[PDB]
Amino acid sequence: HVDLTNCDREPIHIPGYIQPHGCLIACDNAMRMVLRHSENCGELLGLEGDLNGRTAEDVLGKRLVHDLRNALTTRPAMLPAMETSDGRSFDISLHRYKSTTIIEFEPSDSQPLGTARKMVDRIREADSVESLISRTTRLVKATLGYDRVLIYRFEEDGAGKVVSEAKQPELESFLGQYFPASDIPQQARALYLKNTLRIISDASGTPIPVLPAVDVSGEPLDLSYAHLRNFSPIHCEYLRNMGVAASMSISVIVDDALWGLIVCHHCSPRVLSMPVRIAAAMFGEFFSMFLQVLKQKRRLDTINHAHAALDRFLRLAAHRANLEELLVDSFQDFARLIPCDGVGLWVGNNWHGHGATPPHDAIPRLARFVASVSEGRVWATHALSQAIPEAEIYADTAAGMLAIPISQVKSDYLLFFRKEIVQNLNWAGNPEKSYETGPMGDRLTPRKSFAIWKESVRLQAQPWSEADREIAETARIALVGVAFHHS
Amino acid sequence: HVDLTNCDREPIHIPGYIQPHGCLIACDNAMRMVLRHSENCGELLGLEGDLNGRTAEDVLGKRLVHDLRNALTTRPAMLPAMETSDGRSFDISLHRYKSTTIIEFEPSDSQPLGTARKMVDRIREADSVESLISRTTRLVKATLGYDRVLIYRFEEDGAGKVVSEAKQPELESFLGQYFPASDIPQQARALYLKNTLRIISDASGTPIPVLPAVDVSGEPLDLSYAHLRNFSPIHCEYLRNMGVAASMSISVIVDDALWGLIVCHHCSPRVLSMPVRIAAAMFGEFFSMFLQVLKQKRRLDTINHAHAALDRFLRLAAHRANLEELLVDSFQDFARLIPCDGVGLWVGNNWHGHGATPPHDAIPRLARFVASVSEGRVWATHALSQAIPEAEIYADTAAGMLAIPISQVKSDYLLFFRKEIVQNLNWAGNPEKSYETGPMGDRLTPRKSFAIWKESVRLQAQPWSEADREIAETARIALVGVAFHHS
Numbered sequence: 001h002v003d004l005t006n007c008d009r010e011p012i013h014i015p016g017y018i019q020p021h022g023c024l025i026a027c028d029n030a031m032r033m034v035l036r037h038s039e040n041c042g043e044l045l046g047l048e049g050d051l052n053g054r055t056a057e058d059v060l061g062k063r064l065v066h067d068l069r070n071a072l073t074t075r076p077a078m079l080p081a082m083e084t085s086d087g088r089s090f091d092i093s094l095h096r097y098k099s100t101t102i103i104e105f106e107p108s109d110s111q112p113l114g115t116a117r118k119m120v121d122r123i124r125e126a127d128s129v130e131s132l133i134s135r136t137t138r139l140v141k142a143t144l145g146y147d148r149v150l151i152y153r154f155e156e157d158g159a160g161k162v163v164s165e166a167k168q169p170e171l172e173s174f175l176g177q178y179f180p181a182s183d184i185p186q187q188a189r190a191l192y193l194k195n196t197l198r199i200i201s202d203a204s205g206t207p208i209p210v211l212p213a214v215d216v217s218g219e220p221l222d223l224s225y226a227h228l229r230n231f232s233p234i235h236c237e238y239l240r241n242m243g244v245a246a247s248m249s250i251s252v253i254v255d256d257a258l259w260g261l262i263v264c265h266h267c268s269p270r271v272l273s274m275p276v277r278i279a280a281a282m283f284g285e286f287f288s289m290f291l292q293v294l295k296q297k298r299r300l301d302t303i304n305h306a307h308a309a310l311d312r313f314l315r316l317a318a319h320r321a322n323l324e325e326l327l328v329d330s331f332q333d334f335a336r337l338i339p340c341d342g343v344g345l346w347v348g349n350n351w352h353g354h355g356a357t358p359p360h361d362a363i364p365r366l367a368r369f370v371a372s373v374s375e376g377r378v379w380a381t382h383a384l385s386q387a388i389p390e391a392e393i394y395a396d397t398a399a400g401m402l403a404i405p406i407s408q409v410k411s412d413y414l415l416f417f418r419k420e421i422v423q424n425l426n427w428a429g430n431p432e433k434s435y436e437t438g439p440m441g442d443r444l445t446p447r448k449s450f451a452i453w454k455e456s457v458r459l460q461a462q463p464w465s466e467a468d469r470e471i472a473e474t475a476r477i478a479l480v481g482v483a484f485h486h487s
Numbered sequence: 488h489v490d491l492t493n494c495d496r497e498p499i500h501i502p503g504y505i506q507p508h509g510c511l512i513a514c515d516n517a518m519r520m521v522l523r524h525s526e527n528c529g530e531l532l533g534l535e536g537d538l539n540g541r542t543a544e545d546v547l548g549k550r551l552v553h554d555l556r557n558a559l560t561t562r563p564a565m566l567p568a569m570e571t572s573d574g575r576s577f578d579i580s581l582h583r584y585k586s587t588t589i590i591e592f593e594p595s596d597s598q599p600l601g602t603a604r605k606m607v608d609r610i611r612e613a614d615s616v617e618s619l620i621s622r623t624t625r626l627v628k629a630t631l632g633y634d635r636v637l638i639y640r641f642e643e644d645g646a647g648k649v650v651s652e653a654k655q656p657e658l659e660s661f662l663g664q665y666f667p668a669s670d671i672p673q674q675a676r677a678l679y680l681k682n683t684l685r686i687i688s689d690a691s692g693t694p695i696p697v698l699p700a701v702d703v704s705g706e707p708l709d710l711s712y713a714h715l716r717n718f719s720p721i722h723c724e725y726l727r728n729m730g731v732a733a734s735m736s737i738s739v740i741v742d743d744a745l746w747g748l749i750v751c752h753h754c755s756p757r758v759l760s761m762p763v764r765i766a767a768a769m770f771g772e773f774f775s776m777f778l779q780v781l782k783q784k785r786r787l788d789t790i791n792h793a794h795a796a797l798d799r800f801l802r803l804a805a806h807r808a809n810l811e812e813l814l815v816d817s818f819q820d821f822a823r824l825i826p827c828d829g830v831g832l833w834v835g836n837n838w839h840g841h842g843a844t845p846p847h848d849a850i851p852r853l854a855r856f857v858a859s860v861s862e863g864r865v866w867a868t869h870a871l872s873q874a875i876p877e878a879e880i881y882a883d884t885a886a887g888m889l890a891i892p893i894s895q896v897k898s899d900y901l902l903f904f905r906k907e908i909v910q911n912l913n914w915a916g917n918p919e920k921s922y923e924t925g926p927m928g929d930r931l932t933p934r935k936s937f938a939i940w941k942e943s944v945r946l947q948a949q950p951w952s953e954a955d956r957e958i959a960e961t962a963r964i965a966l967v968g969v970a971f972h973h974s
């Protein structure tokens with residue numbers, strides 16, 4: 001049994017069922033004997049009785065089994081349009097995992113490289129992350145013909161954000177919406193990292209059992225790399241509630257991590273033939289590589305811009321006698337270095353604020369706290385009320401703070417602020433739009449997913465990125481440097 | 488007992504002795520009672536009998552003890568020119584570690600900020616790592632008056648390289664010389680990371696014991712943060728063999744790691760007064776911060792240069808019909824992206840070489856190996872013979888290899904090579920120069936240190952840096968990208 005209490009630990013890699021758009025035969029390491037098979041093997045391949053215990057060559061034929069052996073470390077081999085003993089044509093997916101050979105058969109519907117080259121040429125010239133992700137949903141929708149294409153980007157806390165959308169006009173928008181980390185369990189994230197493609201042909205389809213589900217040793221069949229692997233009844237119910245019959249996800253791998261997903265949703269059943277899936281997988285790899293380079297370039301540009309800005313400031317600092325007056329006149333210009341909603345200067349026990357900052361009365365408390373925990377280093381939090389409980393009252397204005405010491409001797413600081421994340425939301429969805437529910441209740445709806453995320457990030461700001469902290473550290477050295485020169 | 492067999496595990500943090508240029512009093516957490524004292528406390532402070540068991544105020548006076556309490560998390564407090572009960576003036580170092588208060592006294596010889604500001608102003612304008620490290624040894628020698636100033640940079644394997652030197656003309660040069668990781672044990676590296684300064688006043692001086700060495704509980708006195716802490720007899724013998732009487736080291740901390748040391752050596756005994764040491768410590772902090780920023784800038788410049796070069800190549804690739812001919816004509820130009828001694832192109836089972844590469848006959852073996860382990864990713868080693876034993880024969884020409892796949896489909900590679908590190912040595916030292924030895928033998932001489940390092944890096948090249956691998960990965964995506972466009 002699986003429910004909302006234990007679905008976070010569901011063993012989705014060993015479901016004991018496949019989807020009905022293909023059939024599955026499990027053989028031993030050397031593909032000599034047939035150990036397991038899907039119940040629908042009889043109907044599709046045209047066989048009678050139990051296949052378990054019979055030889056590989058006896059079931060498929062000496063001709064086919066020889067080709068399968070030649071094809072055989074963990075990445076599945078795609079063999080489109082293969083012929084059986086009785087002439088029937090099938091698309092075959094072959095892989096070996098935990099010293100078990102798994103063979104998947106699809107009714108053949110026969111140019112992967114041709115489709116992929118067209119798609120990859122149209123994204124290769126993109127000169128920004130924004131331009132790449134914007135055109136991709138549009139392009140994938142037009143080429144693959146799904147009713148909705150989304151891109152999810154994973155936050156530091158595992159939450160997903162919808163950062164791009166192409167949809168049918170009549171469908172509701174999820175653009176700028178967040179879902180909590182729990183909506184995609186750890187075991188699901190692990191499989192998304194191992195398989196480029198994940199296909200759900202028909203959410204309402206009857207799943208086909210694998211026989212036997214457990215062998216005599218008490219071992220289930222690991223379907224981690226099987227494209228026919230059946231899906232969790234929790235996710236099934238989620239899709240049914242949304243009016244989604246079919247899905248296909250493409251994993252976005254950046255710097256060997258799961259950056260996010262390209263997800264295609266359809267309102268009617270839909271499976272792509274093996275050749276179209278090979279093309280989509282190749283597009284996924286190229287999209288991932290191009291995004292990785294564009295991310296690297298944006299980081300370089302951001303830090304080069306910060307260096308240029310700090311050099312401009314050091315030049316002015318050499319021509320001003322009173323450094324303190326220059327900081328009072330200039331501090332707001334440091335807002336261009338690090339994305340923030342407000343910035344402040346704490347110098348000679350005097351406060352100067354710009355944009356969204358805590359109230360004037362709250363600053364001395366904040367300054368004393370920073371002085372005690374900083375230890376002459378950059379100090380940052382995205383959850384100010386977890387550090388100072390009475391900061392809760394002004395969380396709408398300033399929920400996050402990054403502190404930069406600007407003196408090696410005195411307790412003078414340059415303070416950067418961010419509003420709580422819900423204040424910066426740009427959501428294009430319909431709040432009136434409601435969803436039909438199943439046995440499990442309204443937990444499995446976009447509406448409730450978004451409400452749970454909003455609760456989890458209350459009194460919290462957008463976290464300070466690795467790039468934000470790198471620029472802050474370079475700014476500390478620059479300002480502490482000139483402050484020493486002027487002593 | 489300590490010898491060459493167990494000096495790697497010597498507990499140098501609990502030696503039970505101090506250096507004779509000061510005296511030490513250990514008190515309880517609250518500085519109420521005197522628990523331990525150095526044998527020379529009587530002579531310097533002018534007291535008689537045992538100090539252990541007597542109250543803090545009884546030994547020092549109600550006046551002094553009140554000031555010490557006010558000064559008191561792990562970073563020692565420097566109190567220059569403090570007066571005792573009987574009028575005597577002392578420089579006092581105060582710290583609290585493992586709930587024990589340690590108080591160190593130096594005969595007072597009384598402007599830290601004034602000296603430091605002069606030194607820091609002369610390094611702040613340096614525009615390259617090379618310019619900073621070159622001027623620093625020269626500057627430190629002239630200001631602090633030591634016979635030799637070295638800068639050591641630590642390699643990935645813990646080995647030290649002499650990257651800058653200012654010395655008396657009559658002394659032998661260590662510039663471009665390496666020492667093995669073992670020459671500075673792990674416990675020594677840990678203390679270098681905790682203390683900015685390490686002082687050895689007189690290598691031939693008689694060490695003063697701390698009484699008691701062990702308390703009744705069986706606990707020794709942890710002198711981790713004590714400037715008077717005595718030095719290992721292994722290092723003592725090393726300095727004596729070199730003709731060095733005194734040393735002072737400044738720790739270089741970059742990105743919270745021990746980057747290296749600024750080491751001052753003197754041929755006669757030498758201790759700097761507390762005010763000069765405060766100035767040297769501040770110079771150390773600023774040198775470390777400026778080096779950190781210059782390292783960051785050089786990395787940015789290197790990767791920006793690689794992007795510019797790859798963009799130039801992509802422009803040419805759009806105007807050439809045959810991409811393979813462009814690679815055959817251009818491959819040597821990729822040597823400008825990544826520091827290497829040679830580069831090669833393996834395309835359509837044909838080899839083209841430039842600079843120091845393996846022999847023509849050895850390449851097919853190498854290409855087959857790369858094809859099997861690469862898995863369509865960047866593969867690199869600095870020790871080629873550990874992967875292919877018969878690569879040993881051509882290690883003088885090519886000991887290191889970095890492989891870049893240039894096709895998603897075919898097994899075509901762009902190969903970068905480095906000679907074994909001893910071929911690239913630029914050593915300014917005297918090979919005829921010999922050293923007197925002590926009981927332990929010739930192991931404790933620069934001559935034998937360098938010989939042991941040379942043996943440890945046989946058949947090995949300069950390791951591929953994080954920046955080298957980052958550029959290689961960006962080059963892979965660029966070349967695999969255009970190769971797909973031309974299919």
Ligand SMILES: *C/C=C1/C(=C/C2=NC(=C\c3[nH]c(/C=C4/NC(=O)C(C=C)=C4C)c(C)c3CCC(=O)O)/C(CCC(=O)O)=C2C)NC(=O)[C@H]1C
Pocket residue numbers: 004006007008010012174178179182183184185188198230231232234235238247249263443444445446447449450
């Ligand atoms: C307690 C377990 C739960 C759970 C498990 C699974 N989710 C899986 C896939 C999945 N879930 C979501 C979440 C969404 N939140 C939205 O607001 C929304 C639509 C706007 C969606 C779709 C996503 C995004 C995904 C990924 C696929 C997709 O986007 O279509 C999953 C794996 C499915 C598989 O086998 O391929 C499991 C298991 N989902 C829950 O909601 C909870 C409670």
Ligand SMILES: *C/C=C1/C(=C/C2=NC(=C\c3[nH]c(/C=C4/NC(=O)C(C=C)=C4C)c(C)c3CCC(=O)O)/C(CCC(=O)O)=C2C)NC(=O)[C@H]1C
Pocket residue numbers: 491493494495497499661665666669670671672675685717718719721722725734736750930931932933934936937
């Ligand atoms: C088995 C233990 C050994 C050992 C221990 C210690 N070395 C310490 C300091 C030290 N050792 C060296 C090495 C050098 N190699 C050279 O070729 C060379 C001169 C050209 C030197 C000086 C260095 C560089 C250092 C750092 C200080 C300095 O450079 O002067 C040490 C700590 C000393 C302390 O208490 O401050 C320990 C312990 N040294 C060995 O050689 C071995 C065998």
Ligand SMILES: [Cl-]
Pocket residue numbers: none
């Ligand atoms: Cl954003």
Ligand SMILES: [Cl-]
Pocket residue numbers: 336
């Ligand atoms: Cl502006």
Ligand SMILES: [Cl-]
Pocket residue numbers: 358359360
């Ligand atoms: Cl205000």
Ligand SMILES: [Cl-]
Pocket residue numbers: none
């Ligand atoms: Cl170098």
Ligand SMILES: [Cl-]
Pocket residue numbers: 823
């Ligand atoms: Cl050139």
Ligand SMILES: [Cl-]
Pocket residue numbers: 845846847
């Ligand atoms: Cl040759």
